């Protein structure tokens, strides 16, 4: 069922690596900073039942079911194993407000939240924007429950991620539920169909580094991930790509001498009919131009296990350059040049 409602959620940009907005859980609402993530399908927030021996719980907002009149107990155990770390707890039901839309939602109350990496998180929890097929405990995702209300103009949602400005008047980003915002893209959308329903993953025809370098020569996969900070490829792919850029490997990332940063070649991703090109300014964290400092790149190695992987992941690095529309009705992803 389709309505005529478009709902927008304003996002805060934390250092070009974390994009989060607000949701309200319970009666009266308890507010949380959440990442709207296409690479996962579960909703979770830290719990008041989390041991204060987990320091990430001490430094985050905690859901207290005892203060909510609309809460409905469940208690089923839940473990969420991600590429960056694991969280676990149990299932709870309550009313969630997201951009003015109110929805009765089943979510995870996290009682085990590791300091590495969650002490580095500015956000409290996660709003999984993925499909039911990837939902742990087969819990209905929030977008499916919003679709069931039949209030949205279209069975789509869109992402705008801005570049990190020091100006407070700068919008960090914006998620539109039920449509797209023409004020944050130009030209037209070009769509690529999903390999299969259940994953925001598309076919990638090839990856180009300048002129003389080539990767994904025989085709590969690309996960379009709003929760991932960077563009990622497999260790092998990223080793060849980084050799071509003259970048040196560290523990969790790759770096270049800051002065070498603006000299780096363009990187192009062949998706559907079009070539999606990023210049050095789009993937180098140009914190200085000094020959005496090292500058990080917004491209990392990440080995995603099957059935989803081995795959590339197009995170915030990609979405900043290209406004993204996630189309559920047609199982496709649309890209347009952001503005
Ligand atoms: C968690 C996160 C939002 C999930 C649910 C899990 C996941 O592992 N990914 C992929 C992913 C890949 C590469 C980098 C990151 N993040 C996410 C950001 C982060 C994550 C954890 C703590 C601090 C900062 C900063 C970063 O490095 C995330 C998701 N699709 N979403
Ligand atoms: C938790 O929720 C699921 C939803 O399908 C339900 O089947 C299960 O029985 C619930 N458990 C309790 C103890 O309420």
Of all ligands present, the nearest one to the C-alpha of 201 is: 1
Asked if the structure places residue 1 within a domain, the reply is no
* Structural tokens at position 146: 């919003």
- For residue 173, the domain's CATH number is 2.40.70.10
CA-nearest of 194, 187, 175 to 271 is: 194
77 lines ligand 2 (CB under 6 A): no
Picking from 134, 160, 180, the residue at the C-terminal end of a domain is 180
163 and 210 part of one domain: no
162 and 228 part of one domain: no
Spell out which residues line ligand 1, taking CB within 6 angstroms. 17-18, 35, 37, 39-40, 82-84, 117-118, 120-121, 126, 225, 227-230
172 and 258 part of one domain: no
Task: Tell me, rounded to whole angstroms, the distance of Cα 8 from its chain centroid.
Answer: 17
Task: Sort 88 into a burial class: Cβ within 10 Å, 0-12 / 13-18 / 19+.
Answer: middle
Asked if the structure places residue 78 within a domain, the reply is yes
DSSP H helices in 199-305: 235-245, 280-283
287 and 205 part of one domain: yes
81 and 221 part of one domain: no
- What is the whole-number distance in angstroms between the Cα of residue 74 and the centre of ligand 2? 6
CA dihedral 297, 303, 307, 308 (to 10 degrees): -10
On the CB side of 320, CA atoms within 13 Å amount to 25
Per the structure, the count of domains in the chain is 2
Mutate to test the pocket of ligand 2, among 42, 65, 72, 74 (most ligand atoms within 8 A of CB): 74
Distances in Å between the Cα of 133 and the Cα atoms of 196, 197, 311, 331 are 11, 8, 18, 14
307 lines ligand 2 (CB under 6 A): no
The method recorded for this entry reads: X-ray
How far is 120 from 134, CA to CA, in rounded Å?
26
- What is the whole-number distance in angstroms between the Cα of residue 2 and the centre of ligand 2? 29
138 lines ligand 2 (CB under 6 A): no
Picking from 146, 161, 180, the residue at the C-terminal end of a domain is 180
Name residue 81's beta-bridge partners.
86
Which domain does 323 fall in, by range? Answer: 181-338
Contact status, residue 33 vs residue 123, Cβ threshold 8 Å: yes
Enzyme catalytic residues: 37, 225
140 and 259 part of one domain: no
- What is the whole-number distance in angstroms between the Cα of residue 45 and the centre of ligand 2? 19
As a whole number of Å, the end-to-end CA separation of the chain is 32
194 and 292 part of one domain: yes
52 and 170 part of one domain: yes
Name residue 323's beta-bridge partners.
336
149 and 246 part of one domain: no
3-state class of 218 per DSSP? coil
């Amino acid at each position: 069922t389709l309505g005529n409602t478009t709902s927008s959620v304003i996002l805060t940009n934390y250092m070009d690596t974390q994009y989060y907005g607000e949701i309200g859980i319970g009666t009266p609402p308890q507010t949380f900073k959440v990442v709207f993530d296409t690479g996962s399908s579960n909703v979770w927030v830290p719990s008041s039942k989390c041991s204060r021996l987990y320091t990430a719980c001490v430094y985050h907002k905690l859901f207290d079911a005892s203060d909510s009149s609309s809460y409905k107990h469940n208690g089923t155990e839940l473990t969420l194993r991600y590429s960056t770390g694991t969280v676990s707890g149990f299932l709870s039901q309550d009313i969630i407000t997201v951009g003015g839309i109110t929805v009765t939602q089943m979510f995870g109350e996290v009682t085990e939240m590791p300091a590495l990496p969650f002490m580095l998180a500015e956000f409290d929890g996660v709003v999984g924007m993925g499909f039911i097929e990837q939902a742990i405990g087969r819990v209905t995702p929030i977008f499916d429950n919003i679709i069931s209300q039949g209030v949205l103009k279209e069975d789509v949602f869109s992402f705008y991620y801005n570049r990190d400005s020091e100006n407070s008047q700068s919008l960090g980003g914006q998620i539109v539920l039920g449509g797209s915002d023409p004020q944050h893209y130009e030209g037209n959308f070009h769509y690529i169909n999903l390999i299969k329903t259940g994953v925001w993953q598309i076919q990638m025809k090839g990856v180009s580094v300048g002129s003389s370098t080539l990767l994904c020569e025989d085709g590969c996969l690309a996960l379009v991930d709003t929760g991932a900070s960077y563009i990622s490829g497999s260790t092998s792919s990223i080793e060849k790509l980084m050799e071509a850029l003259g970048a040196k490997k560290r523990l969790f990332d790759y770096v270049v001498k800051c002065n070498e940063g603006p000299t780096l070649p363009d990187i192009s991703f062949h998706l559907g009919g079009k070539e999606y090109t990023l210049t050095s300014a789009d993937y180098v964290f140009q914190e200085s131009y000094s020959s005496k400092k090292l500058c990080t790149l917004a491209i990392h190695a990440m080995d995603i296990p099957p059935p989803t992987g081995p795959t590339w992941a197009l995170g915030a690095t990609f979405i900043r350059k290209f406004y993204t529309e996630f189309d559920r009705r047609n199982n496709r992803i649309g890209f347009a040049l952001a503005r």
